[PDB]
Design a binder for this molecule. Structure first.
Ligand SMILES: Cc1cc(/C=C/c2c(C)c3ccc(O)cc3oc2=O)cc(C)c1O
Ligand SMILES: Cc1cc(/C=C/c2c(C)c3ccc(O)cc3oc2=O)cc(C)c1O
Lengths: 116, 116, 115, 115
């Protein structure tokens, strides 16, 4: 449960369902290594991306595939994706919720970081 | 469960705890009648404001006491409160989540409306 | 001069044009007295609401008529209006910009207060 | 002319001044090639990044160095940077403003695309 992604739709007033999410981790050579991926559920949430063993310290990028989401709804949006880049677990394990609120030409994102 | 309020703190990356919330409903004479009130919990959520019987159609105002929240934290913020005003239940009962993301000089708010 | 309102549309990626904006000042009896109003321009801005002489310290409310905006574009929105309620304070910077970014079920607002 | 970046601070209610901004263009091999860069002005704006001739259709990334901004103000932030990735499209309006509103653990971004 150390990483969860929650996505909301500001046009519909609903969870953003079936949003693809790709997580990357910066490697020692400075490239972005694929780390985990998944899709938001009916409630706009994506659980089960990783484990506390696997989710070591590092710089992580959470790519939320907003264009793919809006295009699947037959809408032409502005952004390719929403990217959230952050250092994680560098003071020990934390739990991270990455939330995003989507519109066709805009988005908001926040983090909720909790210490278990 | 027809009305829930969720409040997040964009400075801390945490739920906004102990935020006072006052709900009003517009009366037939156009005044704002007190309807319900409460405080956010440790998880930034406020449940139990009303019931499906009580939460009839109307125009509702959810006042989130952001100044009181920031002042209790010893911070001087810009806004007096965040107000969310909406018509509810006019196509039959719905469930409403009013979410707000707070900063000292800014806030975001959204609604998630679901049909039970 | 001391107060400007700027409104943007997050669905179309544009200024929000021809949006009605009403400003009120809180009176001694806690009622909201009309203070100034207008409609946003082609750039989504509303200038000339007040003057330094008139814009004394106190609590003000800026009401942005978002519902009518969305309905005029053929879209059904959630809110009746967006409300921004704040205290004008002489000790802080002199010029207030109240900005709002609109979606059908959401809005963001910020204040940019400068000298 | 065709691209402007505007950055605001939601903690202080001000423009975000002296923020480094880097623009990249996606190359044919999917790498990000440096395109333009600068630091925001006293009004939080960065003008003069490119010209109409240079700003051809394609995918661009605007990276805003938010971490350094917050640290220079003595504040610990969440993100490494804020990223805005979009396609420039000739069929749409000609001028792009990329706006960002910053908090330590959050940001909002919008596009205002006009003629
Ligand atoms: C106004 C606004 C609201 C939200 C909502 C965030 C969250 C929301 C809405 C949320 C809702 C339900 C739940 O079980 C857990 C949740 O966790 C959240 O972080 C997120 C952003 C970025 C925003 O600008
Ligand atoms: C509530 C909120 C406000 C803004 C403000 C954007 C702009 C603002 C505030 C702006 C202000 C003055 C000006 O001369 C030009 C401007 O252009 C803008 O795009 C931008 C975001 C992302 C947001 O969430």
């Amino acid at each position: 449960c150390p990483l969860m992604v929650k996505v909301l739709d500001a046009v519909r007033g609903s969870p953003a369902i079936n949003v693809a999410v790709h997580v990357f981790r910066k490697a020692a050579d400075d490239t972005w290594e694929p780390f985990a991926s998944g899709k938001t559920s009916e409630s706009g949430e994506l659980h089960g991306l990783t484990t506390e063993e696997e989710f070591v310290e590092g710089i992580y990028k959470v790519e939320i595939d907003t264009k793919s989401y809006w295009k699947a709804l037959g809408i032409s949006p502005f952004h390719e994706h929403a990217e959230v880049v952050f250092t994680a677990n560098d003071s020990g394990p934390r739990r991270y919720t990455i939330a995003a609120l989507l519109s066709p030409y805009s988005y908001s994102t926040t983090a909720v970081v909790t210490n278990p």
